[PDB]
Design a binder for these strands. Sequence first.
DNA 1: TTAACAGTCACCCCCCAACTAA
DNA 2: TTAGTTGGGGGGTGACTGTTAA
DNA 3: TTAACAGTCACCCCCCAACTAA
DNA 4: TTAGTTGGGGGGTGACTGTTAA
Lengths: 190, 189
Amino acid sequence: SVLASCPKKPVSSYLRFSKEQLPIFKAQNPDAKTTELIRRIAQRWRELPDSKKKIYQDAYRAEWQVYKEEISRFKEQLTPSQIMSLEKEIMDKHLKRKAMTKKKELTLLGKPKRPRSAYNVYVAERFQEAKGDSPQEKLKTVKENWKNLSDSEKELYIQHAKEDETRYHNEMKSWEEQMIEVGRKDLLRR
Amino acid sequence: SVLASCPKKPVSSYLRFSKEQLPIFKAQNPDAKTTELIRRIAQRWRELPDSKKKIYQDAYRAEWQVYKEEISRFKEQLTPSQIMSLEKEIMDKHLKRKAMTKKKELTLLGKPKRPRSAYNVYVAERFQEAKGDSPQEKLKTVKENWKNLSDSEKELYIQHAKEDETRYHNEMKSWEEQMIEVGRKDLLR
DNA sequence: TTAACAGTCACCCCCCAACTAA
DNA sequence: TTAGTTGGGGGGTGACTGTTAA
DNA sequence: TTAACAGTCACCCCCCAACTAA
DNA sequence: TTAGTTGGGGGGTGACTGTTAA
Ligand SMILES: [Mg+2]
Ligand SMILES: [Mg+2]
């Protein structure tokens, strides 16, 4: 909101060149992957004479002066609630990024999945079957049938969830052992 | 601060017992460490019959109903800016705790200080002599003097800065080997 | 370090809810 | 308490390939 | 997982600014 | 950029001893 309307920083010399060169590179090489294009765009930039590189840098320097003005004026007109709101959206964005990043790291390290409850096994073995014109609607049907489920049938799912608790404790022991060895005792359950 | 005036959740049964016992234990054992008293308080709690622990738990349950009311009333009168401020205050406190925890740990583990620059070694030797009756004011007089320092005499501090940098590397090497024994690649790069 | 550009991909997050380890 | 787990549609995003500089 | 109580200790934080590795 | 480093005054706080439960 306040962060969305906040002036952004100008784009440095190379990225200006890249932004403009990517479409003309993509047009001439349609089935070439973007990584391949950027590799060559970067080459062209490094092979570009400094008389021309400078032109892109001068544009950036002049834009930096517009930005310095725009951000100063923007921050002067912000009320205390808007300043704290801006600070809160920045930190909230930063924490979601940092969370997502650590969830990706833990997945690459091969961290075991947490235990699947008796309800989770019911969702797994009874989702796609149940009526519903949407996944949200299908979960409500599964939840309604989970409540209506007899105590004899609940014991079928309680058992599967008991076997998954055993598999979590065994998998966590090996993973945690492995993590001590890889020098990552910080990841262990305290 | 919205958070400061925010009703706090009731203390659970053990902590109620602790709050009341600590003064009695402290009076009867004046030269005992608080840690030693809490250890004994925790044992008296463990040893307390469940008929008596249930009394402390009933107080808590009844107190939880007062809290549910007080927090509901409090949140209804909060403004969108105050709601957003409270949420920010809670998260800010949480992050400061997590930062401090990592700073204390590194200090516990004996992590060395980073390398200090020519400007740092300059304010380390001449801060005393600097004019001012406040640390903030008298540090300001060394900045305008750091600028007015000729580059020839400024070179005298950059040699002594690198003298310290070599010491930092030797301490860092010893600490990092002692940390791979703890088993923490998380603390290295 | 990391945000600043972009096309494609493959992975994560939100929501619906319930359950439960940390 | 939070967060992650079952399901997936329909959004959102870091890594990849690069350089610059705040 | 962490907030909820407390006494003591040995730090840490935040301000003023400049400088600089990551 | 951020964060940490030089200085310290003037407050703030996690570890330590513990259990409960949101
Ligand atoms: Mg997303
Ligand atoms: Mg990139």
